[PDB]
Amino acid sequence: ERLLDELTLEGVARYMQSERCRRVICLVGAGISTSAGIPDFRSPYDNLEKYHLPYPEAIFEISYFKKHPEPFFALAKELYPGQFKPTICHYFMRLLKDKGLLLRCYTQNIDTLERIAGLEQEDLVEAHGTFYTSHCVSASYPLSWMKEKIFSEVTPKCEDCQSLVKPDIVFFGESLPARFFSCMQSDFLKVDLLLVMGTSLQVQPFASLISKAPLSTPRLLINKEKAGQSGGMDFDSKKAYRDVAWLGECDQGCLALAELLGWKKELEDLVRREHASIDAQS
Amino acid sequence: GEFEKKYV
Ligand SMILES: [Zn+2]
Numbered sequence: 001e002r003l004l005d006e007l008t009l010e011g012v013a014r015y016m017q018s019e020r021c022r023r024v025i026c027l028v029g030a031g032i033s034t035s036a037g038i039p040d041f042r043s044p045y046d047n048l049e050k051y052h053l054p055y056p057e058a059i060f061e062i063s064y065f066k067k068h069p070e071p072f073f074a075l076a077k078e079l080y081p082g083q084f085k086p087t088i089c090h091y092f093m094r095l096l097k098d099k100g101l102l103l104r105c106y107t108q109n110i111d112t113l114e115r116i117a118g119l120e121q122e123d124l125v126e127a128h129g130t131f132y133t134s135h136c137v138s139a140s141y142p143l144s145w146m147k148e149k150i151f152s153e154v155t156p157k158c159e160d161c162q163s164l165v166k167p168d169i170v171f172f173g174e175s176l177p178a179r180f181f182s183c184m185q186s187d188f189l190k191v192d193l194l195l196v197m198g199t200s201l202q203v204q205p206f207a208s209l210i211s212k213a214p215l216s217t218p219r220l221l222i223n224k225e226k227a228g229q230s231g232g233m234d235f236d237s238k239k240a241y242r243d244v245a246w247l248g249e250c251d252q253g254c255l256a257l258a259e260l261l262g263w264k265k266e267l268e269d270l271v272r273r274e275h276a277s278i279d280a281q282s
Numbered sequence: 283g284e285f286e287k288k289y290v
Contacts, residue, residue, distance in 0.1 A: 042289075057289050128287065175286035202290045 004218050007235075007244050009253075012193075012220050013260035016101075021192045023103035024096055027209055031198020031223060032089040032250045033111050037081050043200060049074050062171040066137065069155055069164060077150055081111075085278050089197055089222075090117035091271045092254035095263055097123050104187045106180075108199065108206050110169050117274070125183050127176055127206050129169040138163035176205065188212035194219035198250040201228040218242045222253035 003020060004011040015021050030040035039046055047056050051071045058064050059071040094117050096102035106125040107114055112132060114124055134141040136158035146167060149156045156165035170176055194213050200223070201207035211231040213219060219233060219242060226235065226245055235245040246253045258264045 170287050172287045172289060175284065181285070204288050205285050206287075 001216070002241050003216060004242065004244070007240065009220075009244070009246055009257055009260060012218065012244055013257060015218060016193065016261060022101065023187075023190045024101045024193045024195060025103050025187060025191045026093050026096070026105040026195045026197060027199065027206075028089070028093075028105065028114075028197045029108040029199025029201075029203075031200075032087060033109055033113055033198070035249065035251050036085060036087045036090075036111070036113060038109075038111050038113075039079060041075070041079075042202065047075070049078070057172060060172050062173040065166065065171055066164065069166070073150060073155060074153070077153065083278075084111060084113060084116060085275055086113035086117040088251040088267065088271055089254045090114060091267060091274065092258060094118045094270065095258075095267060103191060104183060106184075106206070106209060108203060110167075116278075125180055127170070127180050129167075129177065131167045131169070133168040134165050135168065136161050136163055136165050141165055184209060184212060188214075191217055193217065195222070196220065196228070197222045197254070199223060199227065200225075216242070218244065220257075221245045222248075222250055222257075224248065 004015055030042055034040055044056060049071065051074060053059060053071055059075065065072050090113050093102065093105055093114065097119055102123055104125060105114055105119060105123055106127055108128050110128055110131055112130055132143060134146045134156065138158060138161045140161060146156055146165070157163065158165055191213060194210065194217060196210065196219060201210070207228060210219060210228050210233065221227060221233065221244070225247065229235070233243045234240040235243050255264055255267065258267045
């Protein structure tokens with residue numbers, strides 16, 4: 001029927017506390033890591049390197065990279081990033097896990113901050129892959145190894161083969177990893193809520209995940225702007241039943257949502273403790 | 283095309 005009593009953060013929180021809401025899926029994008037100093041390269045002034053390119057997405061297009069990996073690589077030296085430490089949103093997703101609410105987190109992001117926030121591979125679908133690993137492109141390497149190669153401004157080449165080595169990312173025009181489809185196809189039969197945070201839903205098939213959700217399943221967007229509207233979402237029409245849109249920074253929305261669940265305090269302590277810990281290892 | 287990353 002209509003599981004939200006109110007199309008609001010207040011309504012969602014209230015729903016999250018009911019016994020009906022057990023399995024939560026988070027769909028997240030570049031918008032949940034920018035406060036961690038990771039610039040959303042899809043919604044860029046950010047590029048400014050020639051390296052003459054027909055358009056930014058070209059450097060991430062797989063054909064182009066294989067012939068001209070340089071634009072991609074000069075970038076990735078430009079965003080270090082100095083050191084990685086995850087956001088309130090990230091740590092929100094951790095509390096979900098800890099509280100037995102996190103069915104799965106599907107990320108478009110390649111920073112691996114979900115992991116550093118305490119989320120284990122079981123909990124996680126790295127839809128577009130990781131930097132952690134890298135392979136010889138020749139279908140016949142660790143972070144540094146590679147990290148060093150990137151900061152030396154020389155392109156990654158295979159020890160054995162001398163062919164290009166790319167990080168284990170899904171480039172555009174590459175197929176997404178298996179796990180993604182097997183996971184989507186049963187997660188989305190079980191899901192009670194959808195948190196969509198920090199994403200514009202301009203990448204496929206990732207963004208088509210919001211339409212796998214059951215008709216009854218409410219969906220909350222925490223994004224700077226509205227997105228995925230039409231199966232598509234419906235926040236404002238008179239027909240609207242299941243969808244809620246909170247506009248602002250991700251970190252702010254997660255603190256708000258957390259306040260209504262009575263977790264703000266725990267979350268803030270958690271971010272603090274974990275960031276202090278990270279510094280220690282320096 | 284199939285099911286692999288593709289922008290807008
Ligand atoms: Zn090789």
